[PDB]
Design a protein around this ligand. Structure first.
Ligand SMILES: *C(=N)[C@@H](NC(=O)[C@@H]1[C@@H]2[C@H](CN1C(=O)[C@@H](NC(=O)C(F)(F)F)C(C)(C)C)C2(C)C)c1cncc(Cl)c1
Ligand SMILES: *C(=N)[C@@H](NC(=O)[C@@H]1[C@@H]2[C@H](CN1C(=O)[C@@H](NC(=O)C(F)(F)F)C(C)(C)C)C2(C)C)c1cncc(Cl)c1
Lengths: 306, 306
């Protein structure tokens, strides 16, 4: 038992991380087969980032303008192109550590692991959710750009995120691995800001089920509620709507605990209207929304990856 | 910016994880050079675990009684011995992925990363603290025994923990890698229980400094306090004493934020006496004590590992 914010083992991604330097900017790249992916703003200078024309900036670059460091081994760049907001650096060596992988784009509300990196050297791993407003509450310092987010499904790494920028509230914005931003953000220095967020209701319910599985039951009750009446309360407290599909997705957890989904919604309703009254759930005094139903099943059943 | 419970990249440990089977019990082993380390209770049957004489149980075992699986490759056991509460299985192949490593024993209050594993297959990574009562609040299911805890310092893995057992409160007990239990726990089925815990004061202060670095300041105040007067409040609220050495260790964070250590103690005193009044710190409504001053510097400055 127990419930931790658990990331996927990072080894398979660690073997792909490289350092990409252009001019005086160094950031991280993802090396898969003979291509290194990195944020295209690597080609920008300080004043370039005020309002950049990336096509113009890139045509003025040369293969030799890109220094790629894989550990203590230089990688020779033999081609370069732009795909949306990422750069694809063609190199003369295919990464022998390339895992089986996919490029997937995730939904707000879904979670992933982040391998935070500096100078192509992994520093730490942690679990994030894609917020409803398409930001992530990460932990990133200068030089972290190009660090990637991912999930692992048996042996295949599904890359879903690459870090580009920090917004003024301290949250983070980036792209999928085809270079398309998550959310209404751009890789230039504007006054862009996150925009209003909501709480991921289905995840809160999943985490309440994890709590029951782990012996926290004080918030339970005999009351029930209807989906429509729950969603009136959700809207009130800035939670997003619960759909029938969410109810279906929570089925396995409902069955394992014996607590009907709508019953647990009644519990959540009471928690929202009354607070916790000094008590905690899974060591938290706040309602946690960055565990999906899948994450809960993973940790409260025990699936591995190879 | 941002502050996450961040684990070390797990790759170097993933390459050491193997499956150890004896009889009908399968658990995880740690494969370094030509030795596989695992909990000695692997040799016990259900009724053996009621009150086992491990020397007697092991003399009745044979090298061929131990099946070691490294991925889809069997490892031939050529020797076996007991070192305190771990088994050392001598195998005919040295692990080619053996990192530089050390066996270190940590102090309560210190943190480490755990690579949770099942059938020698890593499942997830997360960050733990050694509680003052020598338990850890982990996330472990059946088959997780032999999963290890560790820290990484540049390129060297300092193994500090191997998982043995779950206590009735859902917390976890285990050994260092020489097989010596953390805390007053034994690898047999008694009525053993965790025993009273305290809050790691120096860590709470470190996390308050992380909060200030990340822009949370509402809990700050002009008040100060003396070390002795703070420690009277600490004792009251089941916090452990703050020493001058703790104050010294917090020096760098104090200097980076401009908030004197004893001033931040005054802030903590007010937080303990008044609560948070509906506000949060670094996304928590509770005072967090599983980040050390080192962890805070790591994440609020940016050190990597290779
Ligand atoms: C990556 N190593 C670094 N981020 C950047 O260089 C990105 C990048 C260029 C500026 N920038 C920012 O993150 C800034 N953020 C902005 O929203 C804006 F550009 F100013 F509009 C800022 C002020 C945080 C430096 C572009 C947006 C494309 C980085 C990444 N993550 C965290 C940190 Cl501290 C730095
Ligand atoms: C490991 N794969 C598994 N743990 C065990 O088999 C350990 C082991 C034997 C029993 N045991 C326990 O964890 C039990 N805990 C006890 O405190 C006691 F033995 F009963 F006293 C129990 C009841 C949880 C199964 C010894 C203590 C040496 C395991 C590890 N972590 C979590 C889980 Cl769910 C199982």
């Amino acid at each position: 038992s127990g419930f931790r914010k658990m990331a996927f083992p990072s080894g398979k991604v660690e073997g792909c991380m490289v350092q990409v330097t252009c001019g005086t900017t160094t950031l991280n790249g993802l090396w898969l087969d003979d291509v290194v992916y990195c944020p295209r703003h690597v080609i920008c200078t300080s004043e370039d980032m005020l309002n950049p024309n990336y096509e113009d900036l890139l045509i003025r670059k040369s293969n030799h303008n890109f220094l790629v460091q894989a550990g203590n081994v230089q990688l020779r760049v033999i081609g370069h192109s732009m795909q949306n907001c990422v750069l694809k650096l063609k190199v003369d060596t295919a990464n022998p550590k390339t895992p089986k992988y996919k490029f997937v784009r995730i939904q707000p509300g879904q979670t992933f692991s982040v391998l935070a990196c500096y100078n192509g050297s992994p520093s730490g791993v942690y679990q994030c959710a894609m917020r409803p407003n398409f930001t992530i509450k990460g932990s990133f310092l200068n030089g972290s750009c190009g660090s990637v987010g991912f999930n692992i499904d048996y042996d295949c790494v599904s890359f879903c995120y690459m870090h580009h920028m920090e917004l003024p509230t301290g949250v983070h914005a980036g792209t999928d691995l085809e270079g398309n931003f998550y959310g209404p953000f751009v890789d230039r220095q504007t006054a862009q800001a996150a925009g209003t967020d909501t709480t991921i209701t289905v995840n809160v319910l999943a985490w309440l089920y994890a709590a029951v599985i782990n012996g926290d039951r004080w918030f339970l009750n005999r009351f029930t509620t209807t989906l429509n009446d729950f969603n009136l309360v959700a809207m009130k407290y800035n939670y997003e709507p619960l759909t029938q599909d969410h109810v279906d997705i929570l089925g396995p957890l409902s069955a394992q605990t014996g607590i009907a989904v709508l019953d647990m919604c009644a519990s959540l309703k009471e928690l929202l209207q009354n607070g916790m009254n000094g008590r905690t759930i899974l060591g938290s005094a706040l309602l946690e929304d960055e565990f999906t139903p899948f994450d809960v099943v993973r940790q409260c059943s025990g699936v591995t990856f190879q």
